[PDB]
Symmetry: D3
Subunit: 159 residues, 6 copies
């Protein structure tokens, strides 16, 4: 736990897109911290507690990953726990631009943390929590987009 990397998100719910990025980070750091965003406030569809648990179960095959939640600022978290790096994924141009502005502000707020970006794998580049929820609501097959324990909590939620 000399190096620690943080992978932030709402994860509402975690998907195989998220998972890929976490899997492709596990062997490059001593520790991974998947940080879940609190309130904040933003409506639906899984509470904090459920989102954490879903994440915990999709990553239990990965010893160096831990799951936490923060209120404050993502850089304050990183500083709190000794993390020098933040990891995020880029699917698209829109991801890229949104990310440039957030990473700019993060650099001003603390110069000592870097954000490093990985491209989505091509299998997972159209996957959002939003679009998975959309298709789940109409009872479609989601087994290719989300881990099994998440598949269940969606079916459970959407009838």
């Amino acid at each position: 736990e000399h190096t620690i990397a943080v992978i932030p998100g709402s994860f509402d719910p975690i998907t195989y897109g998220h998972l890929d990025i976490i899997e492709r980070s596990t062997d490059r750091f001593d520790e991974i911290h998947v940080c879940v965003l609190k309130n904040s406030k933003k409506e639906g569809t899984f509470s904090l507690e459920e989102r954490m648990d879903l994440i915990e179960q999709s990553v239990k095959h990965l010893p160096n990953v831990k799951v936490h939640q923060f209120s404050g600022l993502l850089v304050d978290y990183c500083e709190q726990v000794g993390a020098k790096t933040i990891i995020r994924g880029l699917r698209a141009v829109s991801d890229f631009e949104y990310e440039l502005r957030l990473t700019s502000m993060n650099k001003k707020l603390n110069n000592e943390i870097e954000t490093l970006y990985m491209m989505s794998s091509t299998n997972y580049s159209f996957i959002s929590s939003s679009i998975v929820k959309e298709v789940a609501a109409y009872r479609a097959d989601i087994s290719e987009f989300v881990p099994p324990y998440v598949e269940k909590a969606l079916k459970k939620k959407f009838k």
Copy 2:
């Protein structure tokens, strides 16, 4: 070559001449066209379902092969329940393109027998959306160029 149905889905809240262009450019290529309004979505907007359909029925009068439908669930299931192999959508801008890439990639996982075909917006309609046409009508400016006469009366009346 066989019987061919193509589906042109959307909110149509309300239909505009930008939408209609894509529909006229598709009639001479399939035997049937289903303009399909995917409501229940609530997630609702400014005209109700029946008025939206009504507005479409009116503006596509001059095209025999165009039916106006509604559907609730998944588009690909609509296509499949009626035997369409083809979804037709328009492209105006880079924002459209990315959003549609994601939708079509998903639609392809769900049912690989449906192809999505894209047409480029004419130059004259590239900037037009339902949204901005409603912003403009809300302040009573001239919308005659953006929508057909019958949609124009309904917007005047809605924002009177």
Copy 3:
């Protein structure tokens, strides 16, 4: 060469140094600058119209020729009535570009006698936005880099 008036529209909720940067790059180019705020947007921000106007006023009193007004109709009509022949907007990013390409296309059809001039944002304010600033303020961090002293004291008041 007549008396030139330019208008700089926006919601300014709140004004930031990136809006200011644009305003300070516009003062010398025109006889009058009108910073124009949006009224009865029937859409709430963090600060009331009157607050927002007050904050601009103190953030611009150091300049010679800038006046803060509100409008509830169309931009091009405000322009029409005060005799403004130019609108000035700032471009930070590609998403700005496309959003703005559509509005000025519409603004040219509505009134083709107003031009919209765009300037690129300065490198050091590229990433600023009212939103990102309010976000940082809510977590009670140092926003001295991003807004004027008067705006900074009013954001600290807001977010405890």
Copy 4:
């Protein structure tokens, strides 16, 4: 519903599975497909016109209704002369989008009776291009994933 002919233009230097993917998604939609290659482009590729035509020919002989031709004038004129009312192109990325928006704008002014239909590339061929393939081939790596056996043997011949 007349005899439909569609044209799939390009330089194909060489044809790759991403061009093929588009062609195989077009076979069933039209009576005839014309894969059209660029002649007297007074602009050299890695393979001569005749080589390029040969490689397409072997890469498409498994399909029912696809014919390989060359043209040295305008695309819309080739279309005009063979009675093709449609052009088919593949969209991989945002830079494709913009480049293509300009060409089809021009193609619509030149001849407004031809439509251009675009399809999104499959996820697994999004990143392919003749160039990236020639690059990988020059370093003599496994290109079996990216082009047909016939193209692969001809790229190995090229680059030792």
Copy 5:
């Protein structure tokens, strides 16, 4: 307010109506306009320097305040040697926007007293560039809509 010069730089190889639009929309805002053709650049293209200037001089006859110049070195130094505080450029598409962001950021390091102002291309000219207008003239199609009569003769003649 003072004496004002604005510079509208470019290749103009050849000038088109897309270029001219940006120039007409700028004449009623500064006292002088210098269309400035930044050649020596070799890196040369299809009309020589004197013919490019010639083509511009002709097409801007109907605007008193427009001078046509040449310059070799840096644009910002040209601006400075003649006392222009303003560079005017057009925007058509997202490719333009990024390229111009980089240029303007550099120009701002080099001389912060020169402002670059951007105008959006009209809808009708959004797809037009010198390049495509030359592609089209090369195959003898109708270019009457893209360039003024005198530029049209020179292109007919160049690609006869």
Copy 6:
């Protein structure tokens, strides 16, 4: 030298944009390898040898950086020397798209290397070797864009 990261480029010539990215990587890996691209063939303006030397001198204040040159494929290099990560910078949307397609192909060619991306600092986001060469040719001031030893080799080259 348990972890090694490779930072590829033509570096014709190295700039303060490149340097930033190399500086912001030095403390996250045991070793940095700045790899210079050979022929390949592409005209002007500095030969391989000069580009390497310029790089060597701009980074000699950074002990864990080394400078090499490769002919073959970038993934073959990484595999040759035990490097699991490739680092590149993103300035813009155009960088992003060009990069997505290259990183896709790299993943096919070797799944065991990741490319990680950092955003240009805002000071350096309009800087290319091309635009620096352009302005240098007209004798303008470049001291804010390139290191001192590079400033000289440009002035020397462009009179």
